[PDB]
Structures are given as C-alpha cells and as structure tokens.
Amino acid sequence: TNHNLHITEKLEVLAKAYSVQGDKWRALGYAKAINALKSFHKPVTSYQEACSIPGIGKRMAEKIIEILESGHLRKLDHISESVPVLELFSNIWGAGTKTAQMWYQQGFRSLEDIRSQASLTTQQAIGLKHYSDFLERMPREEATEIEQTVQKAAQAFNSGLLCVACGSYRRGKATCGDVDVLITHPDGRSHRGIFSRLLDSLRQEGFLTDDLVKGETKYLGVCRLPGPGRRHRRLDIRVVPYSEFACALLYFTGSAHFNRSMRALAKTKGMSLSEHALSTAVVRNTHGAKVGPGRVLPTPTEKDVFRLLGLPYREPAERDW
C-alpha cells in the first residue's frame, strides 16, 4: 500500500518530464526516491523524517515538505509545454528521447504529423501501427495463453524443452505489459537448433505478426491470439544454455530495479552479475568499468546467486524492488 500518494503522484510527473527530456540520471534519482516513498510504513511528516529514508536527500525532502504544507508542488507549474508531445512520441516502440526531440524540433506535434511526414525506422513503423495496443496491459490469463502457445510450438520439436514465462508474470502480477518466454533444455545442447525453426513455426501459424528484433538467441516481436476480440501483444523470447539458466531466469524475472540493485551489490563485492553468469574476481578501473574478466561462479539455482552474494533468498513475488 502507499501512504504517500499525495507526494508520489506529484513526483511521478516530474520524473516523467525529466525522463522524456533525456535527463536520465535526474529521472533515475526521482524514480528511486518514489519507490522508497512507496515502500514505507508511515506518511512522512517532517523534513528530518524525510532525509532519514534511503533515496531521499535534502532536495527531495524540501519537495516533500512543500507538498505537505501547501498540497501542491510549484515545479509542476513550470514543466515545458513540449513534455506531453515528447511523451506521445517516445511511446512509439523503437523511438526514444533523441528521436522524440528531433521530431519535435522538426515541428511535429501529433501522431498524424509522424504518420504523414516523419522518417520512421522499420521498428518505429510497427510501433506506430500498434500504438494503442502497446500501451495496454493484458490480463495474466492471456499471458498464460501466449506462453502455452510458445511452449507447445517449442516442445513439438523437442519434448524436453523447458519454457517459463519470466517477468511480471512470474512475479504474480494481475496484468502484464508483454510476455517474456525463456527456453532451455537440461541436456545442455539440444537448445541450439530450435530457435529459428520455432519462429518459423509460429509465423507460419499466424501467431507472429511482426518482428522487431532477431538475434541468434533473442527475439522481440508481435503476436496475436486467434479468434475475435484479440489485441496485438509484445513477445520476447530467449533461448539460453542450461548452465546459464539460473542467471537468465533471475534477470528475465526482474524487476528491472531489482536487477539493478542486485548488480550494484555484486559490484561492491568485487563480483559481476549478468543474464549469463555471476562472476568473481572481476578487475575494474577507477570508473567502475571492466578491465579484466574474472571467473564464472557455479550457480545451478537462483538460490545459489543469492547465497553467493550474501543475501537471503527473495521469491519472485518479493522482487518488485
């Protein structure tokens, strides 16, 4: 639950304004502060109580106080008039802040302008054609149907293939922004040849409607279940070796902020965590950049990753931040 809604509702506006305008680090600080404020027990009442929470500094506490005594945040009144347009433009899949800012500088103000005059990448044209659909979340039951469709298509090639939807779905959420399907095989090797033939099977069946990204082990695209009343949905599919399964599962399950916290912690302990592996004895320079590789640590299960980092295990539902 959140007992600081009257504060966070105002902060989210500012954080989004900073995000679409490209000030990503300031936005990150706002996001983190907003999460910290949602994850609390008591409505904040003092500048001193505010600064005590992790993720809240003097500036953010000043803002919270201006909120408690006045009910309003003056800074909301000086957001640039371009921000709603930038948000509109960057909600196109494949367009971000830089593209939105360029479109805005060219004088474009609406999606009709984009459709008729803008130069679009292949991805951005798919994103525009599904603009409304991609802003919607689906019921988890539909995510289940999409996962089962992928699983049944994959297990037709090799019965031994394991398929797991990993994302807000695995974290137990009632709705899902897209479906994240991780595929492996405990053999350790048969996963190698199935990916392209799987995608051919799904697009031959009419399930896949558009491709966004096509790597050797990574796919991002668009699907739609058959029959009436169905929307187009974003679908991400990864195929990983069994030895990397635990770390791929952890990454793909998220949340994103959870992953960043876990990876930041690993960095403090001279380790490095990615979707491939947890590594130890990684040599870095004075800027936190990697100059030497280190060695992979055995992580047969998600619990092993937590254990090697000195943390208590957190269930997927407990990984929202």
Add this chain to the structure above:
DNA sequence: CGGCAGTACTG
C-alpha cells in the same frame, strides 16, 4: 567528483 547494471540488436 562522478557513478548510477549489464547486455544485445540495428543501421
């Protein structure tokens, strides 16, 4: 002062 996660596709 200066990092803020680590990776992968596109063109």
Add this chain to the structure above:
DNA sequence: CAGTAC
C-alpha cells in the same frame, strides 16, 4: 559508433 530496448 549512438540509439533503443530487455
């Protein structure tokens, strides 16, 4: 590479 995305 810069931009964008998971």
Add this chain to the structure above:
DNA sequence: GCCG
C-alpha cells in the same frame, strides 16, 4: 535527483 542521490550517495560514497
């Protein structure tokens, strides 16, 4: 934006 925050924080070491």
